[PDB]
Every structure is written in C-alpha cells, then in structure tokens.
Design an enzyme around this catalytic site. Structure first.
Site, PDB file in Angstrom:
ATOM      1  N   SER B 183      33.900  22.367   0.584  1.00 36.85           N
ATOM      2  CA  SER B 183      34.076  21.079  -0.087  1.00 36.85           C
ATOM      3  C   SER B 183      33.111  19.965   0.329  1.00 36.85           C
ATOM      4  O   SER B 183      32.643  19.202  -0.515  1.00 36.85           O
ATOM      5  CB  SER B 183      35.522  20.603   0.085  1.00 36.85           C
ATOM      6  N   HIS B 211      37.105  25.415  -5.716  1.00 37.48           N
ATOM      7  CA  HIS B 211      35.888  24.699  -6.093  1.00 37.48           C
ATOM      8  C   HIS B 211      34.834  25.609  -6.719  1.00 37.48           C
ATOM      9  O   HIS B 211      33.634  25.378  -6.559  1.00 37.48           O
ATOM     10  CB  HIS B 211      35.285  23.981  -4.881  1.00 37.48           C
ATOM     11  N   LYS B 242      41.593  21.155 -10.854  1.00 37.37           N
ATOM     12  CA  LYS B 242      40.174  20.826 -10.770  1.00 37.37           C
ATOM     13  C   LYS B 242      39.437  21.122 -12.075  1.00 37.37           C
ATOM     14  O   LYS B 242      39.585  20.393 -13.056  1.00 37.37           O
ATOM     15  CB  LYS B 242      39.524  21.549  -9.584  1.00 37.37           C
TER      16      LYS B 242
END
Ligand SMILES: Cc1ncc(COP(=O)(O)O)c(C=O)c1O
Ligand SMILES: Cc1ncc(COP(=O)(O)O)c(C=O)c1O
Lengths: 396, 396
Positions: B183, B211, B242
């Site tokens: 991240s 991610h 996300k």
C-alpha cells in the site's frame, strides 16, 4: 497443498458423519414474514428481523434515493476520504437515541467488538466476561493484553468472585463485558446487579446490545433502559444487521473520551473501508421510524410473543421462561430438533434447531423468533404445525 | 470510572500536541475525481476508487433495482436465512473472474483475513508473513496458534531464511502470507520467486490482493496474472471496497475443500450478518462491466500513471519506481508531508501525507492515487499544484 486437502476432506467427512455439516438453504425472496426457501413459500421464524425492517418499503425507497444522492461506494477509510455528512449524522443520532456522548461507526458489530478492548485496555488491566458472551467479544478480548476472567452465565455470583479475584490481583482498570441478551435463551442480563457490582469494585460496564437495541425497553433502547440502569453502562456496542434494517454495520457508543480514543486507535476503524452510503443513509430513515412506528411495532412484537407463548404451553411444549422476542422450545434431543425443524419446513414453517456445541448436550432446542410483522393467522399456522409435527414425532 | 477518562484525556493531549491526533475531514459529495471536502470543490487524488466505479451511473442504476428486488437487509447469518440466490451466484462469478474453484463472502476483507488463519492452521503449523502485510492479516495471525515468522519487506531473501527457520522447528504445514501490492510503496510483490520457494520448501501461498484485483494484470485479475504465477497461489483474499465498487464486502477464494471448511468454521462467517443484498447483486453488475468497460479503464489508468509520473519528474520530485496506480511522492520529513498536503488542499488538490509510524522514520511521503476517471487536465492542475507548493515549501 494436497497434504492439507488430505487433512481437510477427512475432517469434513467427520463433520458430515457427525451431523455437523453446515449446508445453506437458498432464500429466493426478500426478507419477510413470508419467504421462499427454494421454490417453497414458507413462514419465517428464523431471521433477526425483529421489527420487520429488512424489507420495509419506506427504507427501500430511501435506499433508492440515497444511493444516487451519495453514490455507491467511498473506496476509503473514514480518516482519508471515507467520512461523509451521513456518517457523522448517524453517529450523532445513535448517540441521541441511546442517550450517549458519541458513537463510532464500524462495518459490523463483530468488528466493533474486535476493536474495543485492545484499544482501551492493556496488560495492567483486567476483563471479566460472561461465559456465553458473543464470539466477537471473545475474539476482541483475545486481542488484548489485559487479564482475562470468565464467570458463569448470570452468576452474581461467579461474577463477584471474579471481581475479587481480579481486584485482589492488582488490576488498574476492570471492565465487565456481557451481552444484553443471551441468543440461545432469550434471557435478558441482570444489569442492575452487574452495575451494583461495578460500583463496589470500581469497574467499567460494557454491554453488547445487538439482540436488544431497537425493541427492548420502554422506548426500545435496550437492556440499560430495561433494567433501569441507564447511564451506569460505560460501553454500548451493537449491530445494524439485526433489528435495525438488517443490512450490516455496527457501532460502539459511550463517553466522548472513549469514542475519540477508538476513532484514533481502533484498528478495524482505521484499516477497513467505510460503511456504504446506501446503508448509512437508509439507517437514518430507520431511526426516524423507531420514533414513529417503533411503539406500534414494539407492542405488536410483545403481543406476538405472548400469543405464541400460550399456544405452545398448551400443546405441551416447554419454553425457557422470559419476556423476549426469542423463544427457545426445549427439545433436549439433538435429532429431535433437527427432525422437527426439517418436518416443520414442509409444513410451511421455517425454523432452525441448535445443538452441542452451540448449546449443552441434552439441551438442544429450536429457536423461534417473533417479528413485529407476524400476523395472528401466521402465528396460528405455526403453532398448529408445531402440533402436527409435535405429536407426529412424539415430542408432545 | 472517571479515573479512565483522565488517563484517556492525559494521553489524548499527548497525541494532539505531538501531531499524532487524527482529525477527519468531511466529504460532502459522492465519490469521484471531482469531489468537495467540506464546502470547497477539489480534485481527489487519495481514494482507492481505481476504476471509478464508486459513483458509476450503471452501478447506481443497478443498486436502485436490486434493493427493491432483494430487500434492504437479511437480518441473518449466511447459514440460517441470509443466503440469497444472489450470494452464491456472486461467489460463483468471483471464482470465474479469478481462477478459483469456489468463493466465500465476508462483509469485508478485514473479516476475510481474520477468519482465515486460525480456522485453517494449528499450533503445529507456521505462518511466514511480510513486514508490511496489512493489519487484517497481522490481526488474523494473532488469532491463530501457528508459529509466526516475519521477513524483511520483499526480501526473497530473508523469506527463505524464515522458511528454513520454520522447518528447523518442525512445522507440518507452513503458509506464506503477503499483500499482492504494498500500500505505501505501490510495489508489486515478487510472486514468482515466493512461489518457487513454496515449491522448494513445500509451503503454501496466500495473497491479499485488495490493491490489485480489478486493474492489475491484462484482464484485471490481479497480481498472480500480472506476475504470471496463475494457478500457483492457494489462498486469495480481496475486497470490494476499492476497485470493485468501493461499497463494502470481502472474500476468500481458492481450492475446493478450503473454502468449504471456511464456510463451516470461519468465525466471522458464522457470527456476522450476511452482506447486504444491495451490494451483493450490484457487485455482480461490477463484474459484468469488467467484461466490456474493463479494457479501456485499465488503459486510461496506465496512461494516467505514466503522465503524472513524468510530469512530477520534470519538477524534480522524487517518486518510488513502480507500475501501479499508487504513486508515492517521497518527502522525507513529517512536517513537509502534512504542510504540503494542507497547502495543496487550498490549491484545490486533496491528498494525504503519511509518516511514522505509518512509514519508516525520515521517510514521509504523499501517497497519490490514480483513477481511470482522471482527466489529463486534472493531472496538469495537480502536477501544477505540486510544483507551486514544492517551490514555496522549499522541497524542489
Ligand atoms: C491489503 C488490504 N487488505 C485488506 C484490507 C481491508 O479490506 P476492507 O476495507 O474490506 O476491510 C485493506 C484495506 O484497508 C487492504 O489494503
Ligand atoms: C451479541 C452480538 N455481537 C456481535 C454481533 C455481530 O454483529 P454483526 O452481524 O453486525 O457483524 C451479533 C450479531 O448477531 C451479536 O448478536
């Protein structure tokens, strides 16, 4: 990889070969009193839809309005760019509803409990838990350096002995953790006594009010209001995936300093996507309802419970005493609970039986749950079916 | 009592007059490239909304229908009466997107990670994790009984040393846990090597691709595809908060018996409300989009990143070399990060700076996050602002 599949498959066998394989039923309809399980239209006495808000039209309309108004997702933690006017407003309203300083929003009550103790208590402290506290509590405590004490369910009792034991060990802060209601009994906790103990031993009082907030108490505030100990309970956690909408979300509510500390430290609150605007905003409508329809629904709920209690005591069924939407029909036998629930499903009545390790061995049961929407016709057909399958299986 | 309000206050004054206290800003609009923090309209460059689905008209239009069609909430866990035809289907579609046999749903990837390790591993096992693994994982390991080993970030390296070390004490089952993307760096994990190590040492491989899933790889399938180790990772956690909606939800997909075991033993799955139908079905729409609009959206993000990359290098800004929507702007000291973040805000650009403990000492940074719905003009405005502020604050 195969080595563990040689270990998982075998264990799964043991589960199935011990009547412990969780196979899920497919609900082919929205959540209501009447539902479709598979192709079968059945009455629902399974869900925690205590007030029948799961498919409340006013809420689904609001949902359709707000999702457009606020978007579908925030894709961010509260701190960064995931906090909206809704979130602060909802936390502000929950506090007004419960009568507390502030509230902290979580994706669930499960996380709310996971991110409570670790943040507040350390090694120099002590947590004292009721044996049958929720799992989330149990795992929130495991993520904590504090000393751990577990007392018998509603023993005031095993509690005080746990307070002395802890008090006499040298605890800096003592927190008393407990569920407001016991999900398998429908029994409400003794806050009065618990609080009375918190005073003599200078301890804090935490209460998970999931199966209480929204319908329990005069104004449906929960266990604190019920036991008349309001403002004696230091910490109040709860879900929204129960009596309040049933979508998801959870919270912790109390003094400004505790909530602020959690908001700056609580790991679930810091490392998890913010609650969806759809449910946060719609939740604002749910609180509005409790103020308008709440009373009616709470009265409908009590009457439903009462009516079902009488017909079931008359058929011969023995039910755990209590004044709660949760009504455990004591069957004692593990297979009997399964069979009945299985048979009842055919009689258009959908319920679920719990057995060891969920409950003690020889204390199996079917947990029937009242909704503020359960009509009398539905209650009669259910009771009626509990007779059909009741005598058919020699239960009564 | 009141005694705890004092130790909390006396520690809150600590964080406050230390720059550690967190003060959330309030986003007063839906999630987009163009948002308004408070009343001021700024461009958003710090959101995990990578594909821009947060306020996507099609998704919003699907949410409106689904909530009416499936209800607002289920008010129940999956097993009892929380599993709709839409919950199974989603898992199915998730497994097809990725290369997994089955998939289990959680209310968040924070729950997914937590109910993964202890369920799947015992005291006779061992989990080898990266330093910078998300908290979800760390917290997940802390509930498990397995021996724990932590290797230096992206050291292939120190990892192998912890694998030898893991066997030196007789671990029957050992697992490698890692983020798919780190991240704070925007760096892709060395999945190729790690997998070769799983081979040589007979360990499993679990990746957290919160991610990555949706935008990384040719078809957005994440880091495994990207790193070309497809069908070599056993456990795959991920989020929907996300790139894939931003609303909420998490999952764990992989082989057969693993996800069946989790569905029977994973605590957060057995003791937490089912994901809201509104989000479940909408997520189904997300995946459909990822079939048609997917390609272009990834391409836009690819260009965007490069553009911003080069533009910032013109100004002499120091970045972290990477091929990811996460572009870290190395700032060094904490004051620069926060002060530059503040000035940019007034310049109309909203970004968040991070420093110890969030990152190593003397290594602060502004984490700029690229979206597909980012325009070249917006990039020029931002890049422009970074120059103006960089010069003024004496950074460039
Ligand atoms: C790598 C990683 N895993 C898991 C999570 C948590 O997912 P969720 O926001 O759904 O709880 C995050 C986000 O904070 C993350 O970055
Ligand atoms: C006492 C208690 N704690 C925690 C939870 C979990 O809350 P949630 O379903 O929002 O995750 C529940 C839900 O049933 C509960 O009854």
């Amino acid at each position: 990889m195969q080595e563990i599949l040689s270990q998982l498959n075998k264990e799964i066998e043991g589960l199935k070969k011990a009547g412990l394989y969780k196979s899920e039923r497919i609900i082919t309809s929205p959540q209501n009193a009447e539902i479709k399980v598979g192709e079968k239209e059945v009455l629902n006495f399974c869900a925690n839809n205590y007030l029948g808000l799961a498919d409340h039209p006013a809420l689904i309309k609001t949902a359709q309005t707000v999702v457009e108004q606020y978007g579908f997702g925030m894709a961010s933690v509260r701190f960064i760019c995931g906090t909206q006017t809704i979130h602060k407003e909802l936390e502000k309203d929950i506090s007004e509803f419960l009568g507390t300083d502030d509230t902290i929003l979580y994706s669930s009550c499960f996380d709310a409990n996971g991110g409570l103790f670790e943040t507040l208590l350390g090694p120099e402290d002590a947590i004292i838990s009721d044996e049958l506290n929720h799992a989330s509590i149990i795992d929130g405590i495991r993520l904590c350096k504090a000393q751990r004490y577990r007392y018998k369910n509603n023993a005031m009792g095993d509690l005080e002995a746990k307070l002395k034991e802890a008090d006499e060990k040298g605890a800096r802060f003592k927190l008393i953790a407990t569920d407001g209601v016991f999900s398998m009994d429908g029994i409400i906790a003794d806050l009065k006594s618990i609080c009375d103990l918190a005073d003599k031993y200078n301890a804090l009082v935490m209460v998970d009010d999931s199966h209480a907030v929204g319908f329990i108490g005069e104004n449906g505030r929960g266990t604190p209001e019920y036991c008349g100990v309001a403002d004696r309970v230091d910490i109040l956690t709860g879900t929204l995936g129960k009596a309040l909408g049933g979508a998801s979300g959870g919270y912790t509510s109390g003094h400004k300093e505790i909530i602020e500390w959690l908001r700056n430290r609580s790991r679930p609150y810091l490392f998890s996507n913010t609650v969806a605007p759809v449910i946060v905003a719609t939740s604002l409508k749910v609180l509005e309802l409790l103020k308008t329809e709440g009373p009616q629904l709470r009265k409908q709920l009590q009457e439903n419970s009462r009516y079902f209690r009488a017909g079931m005591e008359k058929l011969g069924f023995q039910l755990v005493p209590g004044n709660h939407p949760i009504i455990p029909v004591m069957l004692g036998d593990a297979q009997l609970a399964t069979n009945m629930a299985d048979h009842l499903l055919q009689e258009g009545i959908y319920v679920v039986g719990f057995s060891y390790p969920v409950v003690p061995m020889g204390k199996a049961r079917i947990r029937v749950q009242m909704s503020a929407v359960h009509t009398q016709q539905q209650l009669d057909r259910a009771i009626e079916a509990f007779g059909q399958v009741g005598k058919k299986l020699g239960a009564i």
